[PDB]
Design a protein around this ligand. Structure first.
Ligand code: FES
Ligand code: FES
Ligand code: FES
Ligand SMILES: [Fe+3]
Ligand SMILES: [Fe+3]
Ligand SMILES: [Fe+3]
Lengths: 401, 401, 401
């Protein structure tokens, strides 16, 4: 309701003027975080144009296996086709538009629409349509495809018919990710939450640890030009065949780095030790730490020697964002034997809840018409500024006539 | 929320251009089913201008008896006046605007506003107003009336001050309906549900049985130029004094036809036999089947030899529609003796729930910005096309300067 | 949902033309009570520009004590500063905008933001900010203040940087209020409710007792040029040092009058007797009755010899209004000894619920597109007209170029 109150008296969003006068050292003016007009632009120009992380490919290990997701108002279905390729389609029947797959996941022989049973093969092709006449050309009524790439076991999609370059990022990232053998994972746990903040607020909060000391007791135990200590850490990883070195995109979109953990910590556990005894991938040394990877606007990620976590950021409304956290473990690791579910997840479930509380409290103060932009900490918040620059530049380029 | 997501990035509704390029062989472009702009037009120009089925007149059998309903944002009260006429008024007090009748139904001597007790007679006339002065003319402050017609026991209303012609339809329909003696009915059961689809989607789904084979196991047992078999069926009805022949409005608004049922079925029951042993009206022969009647935009109807069902379609929002199903039986049929409530209603309660699920699943895929119009089946969906033509033509004529 | 339905087909709000043709003898045209456009104007020009009652100052009796409230989309914090002054600030951190105080009330040493711990003194001054560099000037990043006045124990605020004159009203009211010793009160009970009516509807209903006879059985027992009887009542109060005489603002904004109660009643109790045995203030005589005070747009008030009630009116949306009723009693009156909570509150809790029902029923009829303005009763509704004139004039003056 704060959102509605705030809406009423807001000055016009005059987006070009706001972008023109924006200073990189400062939080965004209110309508970036609260307005429906900027939200529609963020959808149209960011989420509907960039590559987005969807799910781990291991969720689609089986024959005829499918999983569905919403991206803004798009309903997407991702399916393992007959020929073993993974493909993605718009989950909308070409007859009258019905969703075809209604469950979050399943297995099918064919994609059969529940309304009137137009039946499609798993590559999208319409192979039967009831009583449509002889003037019906089934070749014009195949499922609409959705661009898809496999990033070394992690499925990404893009809803534009003209997607940007994914290959540069894929080629940069393979070395770092291939060593995790993600295609041999299974999902041990998924947690989906809604945060009552604009997606930008979720990213700003992710891209600093300025707030961590006070707000993240559990994570702090394990989670901490290149400094001396740090290069030394990259050197042990790389000496052992485990790529680790800081890579930052030219345009700031993604970043990869294998960072050391605090103290004697090996993993994101309350005791600091490995959560899973049967490791996912061949990372060495054991204290190689965490491979941080972000790709804007959809995902941040921690790949550890024993297990991995992917984080998917999706917009729900101007002041709501769905965060999906997926724990990946070796496909033959056994719950109750090789890992304990509580021990595996408790750290990040608590961290996520603490972040959500912070983001939500932040959003509420921002909705005040008295909110003005404020200065980011150069020492503590340069990753926030780095995110906000990427956003603003993406938006300016999409708005260019 | 899908509805909100979808809204953001939608292209302008440019209604004239959409209507201009519309082809009758195809489902509507997205904003017809999802947009608030077309929804307001549908209210203003369709629901607020056409005659609408409201309720069976038997709900108003008693002296001073009233029933209320909402039509979009209109609150209407229908009352049996002192002189035995049924009249309808705007349920808004002429003083400061309060609802007068707050319950769904009741009986009163007078209509007394609960705020300040301005008191009206049952023909709308204000007969007392407290301490209003001598410069108060009560004759200017009678309830505002609502146009009303009685279709042979079924009350219809129209919220325009200039209603279209109802008499043509009334004169066509009397022969078909008079034989059901609807004025001697009682309501044995009413079911009200909300479907999460645009009202148009509810009508398209009603006007085909393309989806029935797969989706309606219960109904299929009883529910199936003029063909040979069919004319033969009309001939037995009409030979016996029971009008049955297909009548379709010039402008496509309504339609009446007494159709045969499957197999040995006499009624909409799980066993195919009559639900009520004491029949409503004098229909013959017993296997005369069902009198189908639709009148756009508000109602479809099945009148059987033993009992009848009316269906009222009312818009709630761009993606919500209230369907009210009323089972009418002879006023002296006794629950537990002449009929069993479960046996009377189970078929259509399940059918309605199956239709609602289908409509809702259809609406969700339509909200995808990838939804495009698709071709209707000429063999299976001509009634859908016939409905969509009536809608588009109604809207084009209202938009004409 | 009525609100949404109503919205769709409404004619433009053309506010100037509506104000131009407005007649003082008549209820407002629909969009004043139902539209989001007039709601935003009411926020921007009324609620965000006038002085508003916030809370009793006794809620802030302690060192470091604070209480928070929302006014439209503003989040405000009121704090007892180190030096004993009460001050109000925008509850938004100057760093990235977070709420600082999250609870409704509490005590602090300092105002410490929960996100990153920027720490402020209780006068607003930022005294520590972590790792902001040497180019950080903390003097530019103090909390934004909110104008505040103390009306003889009752805290008022104003969100404009250029508040209107409060002193005239404060100087008129002190004599009437000082005798209640409000600074020595405590809150014995607070009740917060939401009424589903526009705030204007809540005020119109407050400003008449045209509806009371039928709708307020409990209150009627105690609640009833200057008439003879009435001047006689003011004369006993004033003879005894208790100011009582009718004072109405020049511009109609406020009004004060100590009115007599019915019968032998001394207080707002089911039995008519004093609710609290230990009196709040030094009012005499004992049957001095109730000091009525209203100040538009935020508050009406009953100050009795034994206890007092303040009523705070805040807008939530076009058809929702939060009413907060606070019972004040002497700070040393003891619950269970000097008063019984039920006996103290039952009359106004029931009255408020009856008013809310009436306002809600009124709002629903108003949402009908058939609602037209109607005539107010000159004898019974002149206070309603007096309120509506104040509103319209306030709005016209704010809209003046
Ligand atoms: S909507 Fe899919 S078969 Fe008809
Ligand atoms: S609103 Fe109906 S009598 Fe006043
Ligand atoms: S938002 Fe308050 S310290 Fe950062
Ligand atoms: Fe965090
Ligand atoms: Fe159906
Ligand atoms: Fe009242």
């Amino acid at each position: 309701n704060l959102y509605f109150q705030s809406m009423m008296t807001a000055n016009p969003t005059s987006i070009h003027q706001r972008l023109d006068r924006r200073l990189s050292g400062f939080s965004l003016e209110q309508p970036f975080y609260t307005s429906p007009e900027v939200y529609a632009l963020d959808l149209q120009h960011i989420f509907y144009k960039q590559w987005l992380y969807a799910v781990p490919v291991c969720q689609l290990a089986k024959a005829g296996s499918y999983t569905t997701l919403r991206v803004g108002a798009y309903e997407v279905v991702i399916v393992r086709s007959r020929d073993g390729e993974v493909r993605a389609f718009h989950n909308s029947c070409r007859h009258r538009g019905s969703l075809i797959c209604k469950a979050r996941q399943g297995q099918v022989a064919k994609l059969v629409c529940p309304y009137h049973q137009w039946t499609y093969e798993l590559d999208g092709k319409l192979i039967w349509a009831n009583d449509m006449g002889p003037d019906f050309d089934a070749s014009k009524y195949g499922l609409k495809p959705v661009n898809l790439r496999n990033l070394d076991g992690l499925i990404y999609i893009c809803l534009s018919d003209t997607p940007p370059d994914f290959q540069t990022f894929a080629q940069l990232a393979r070395p770092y990710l291939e060593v995790h053998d993600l295609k041999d994972a299974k999902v041990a746990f998924t947690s989906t939450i809604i945060e009552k903040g604009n997606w930008k607020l979720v990213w700003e909060n992710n891209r600093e640890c300025y707030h961590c000391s006070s707000n993240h007791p559990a994570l702090c135990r394990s989670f901490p030009g290149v400094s001396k200590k740090l290069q030394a850490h990259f050197d042990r990883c790389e000496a052992a065949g485990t790529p680790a070195q800081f890579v930052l995109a030219g345009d700031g979109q993604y970043r990869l780095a294998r960072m050391p953990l605090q103290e004697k910590a090996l993993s994101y556990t309350m005791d600091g030790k490995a959560a899973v005894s049967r490791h996912l991938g061949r990372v060495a040394p054991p204290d190689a730490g965490t491979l941080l990877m972000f790709h804007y606007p959809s995902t941040w990620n921690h790949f550890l020697p024993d297990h991995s976590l992917t984080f998917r950021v999706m917009p729900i409304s101007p002041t709501e964002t769905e965060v999906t956290t997926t724990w990946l473990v070796h496909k033959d690791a056994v719950e109750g034997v090789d890992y304990d579910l509580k021990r595996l997840t408790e750290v990040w479930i608590a961290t996520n809840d603490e972040d959500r509380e912070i983001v939500e409290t932040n959003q509420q103060g921002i909705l005040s018409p008295a909110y003005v932009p404020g200065p980011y900490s150069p020492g503590q918040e340069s990753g926030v500024m780095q995110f906000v620059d990427w956003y603003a530049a993406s938006l300016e380029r999409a708005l260019a006539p």
